[PDB]
Ligand binder design. Structure first.
Ligand SMILES: *C(=O)N1C[C@H](NOS(=O)(=O)O)CC[C@H]1C(N)=O
Length: 262
């Protein structure tokens, strides 16, 4: 009961809703949940779904990971630490997905949405792999607005957890594409103070973090002991006036509990 108590205590201390799934990667069955059917802004966590959609196109040969995209300084939106450094040489679709997931590059995310036909086509992709709940409507950075009770650019903990399992382990993507997606998430360099902060030596983690307006914060992860993922964790919160630091520490403490009671 310890981990669900942490989530409830986090709600108390953040003054906001927290959504939680712990999913068995093998069976795909929910082990624990909190507000599993409630909507939360995906924020940057959507970039894993976007690169899923890109890889599905690469498998079908409508995209090539080696294909180079040139863009202009005028295409650059807030938080573009990789893409602002490749204005003369451009970047391959592979490099863009690397930027989107490992660095949460916002311009990378928009360039990739253009490659698939935008938010409506990411939603179509999720619909057609059996996720009729998750929806993307807007581009970076507007999809992070987190307007209370707005369903635009939202998922549920349940839908995100099951969708992430299908992308990483389901029949949808080729083995090569599943390996490349989980590899990008393993190489995440912007989620240090979250689940990674509670991870013991020898454990595997592949994750993607997110932050938005109105105290929005979240993480999706495949993790497990002995260097192999065996569970999917989804944590979302929205509405809190809490600092980025407190929100990070609350997610870390939920992580510490689920690892403690593995
Ligand atoms: C993702 O939600 N975002 C991109 C960037 N990195 O934050 S993250 O590592 O939690 O992904 C900055 C904030 C945010 C955004 N508003 O786009």
């Amino acid at each position: 009961p310890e981990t669900l108590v942490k989530v409830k205590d986090a709600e108390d201390q953040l003054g906001a809703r927290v959504g939680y799934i712990e999913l068995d990667l093998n069976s795909g069955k929910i082990l624990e949940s909190f507000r599993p059917e409630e909507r939360f802004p995906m924020m940057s966590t959507f970039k894993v779904l976007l690169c899923g959609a890109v890889l599905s196109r690469v498998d079908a040969g409508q995209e090539q990971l080696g294909r180079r995209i040139h863009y202009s300084q005028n295409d650059l939106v807030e938080y573009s630490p990789v893409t602002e450094k490749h204005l003369t040489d451009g970047m391959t679709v592979r490099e863009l997905c690397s930027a989107a997931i490992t660095m949460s590059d916002n311009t990378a995310a928009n360039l990739l949405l253009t490659t698939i036909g935008g938010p409506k086509e990411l939603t179509a992709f999720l619909h057609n792999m059996g996720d009729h709940v998750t929806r993307l409507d807007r581009w970076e950075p507007e999809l992070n607005e987190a307007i209370p009770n707005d369903e635009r650019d939202t998922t549920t903990p349940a839908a995100m957890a099951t969708t992430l399992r299908k992308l990483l382990t389901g029949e949808l993507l080729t083995l090569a594409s599943r390996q490349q997606l989980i590899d990008w998430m393993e190489a995440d360099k912007v989620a240090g103070p979250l689940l990674r902060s509670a991870l013991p030596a020898g454990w595997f983690i592949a994750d993607k973090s997110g932050a938005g307006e109105r105290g929005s914060r979240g993480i999706i992860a495949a993790l497990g002991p002995d260097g192999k993922p065996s569970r999917i964790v989804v944590i979302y919160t929205t509405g809190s006036q809490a600092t980025m630091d407190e929100r990070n520490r609350q997610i870390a403490e939920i992580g510490a509990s689920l690892i403690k009671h593995w």
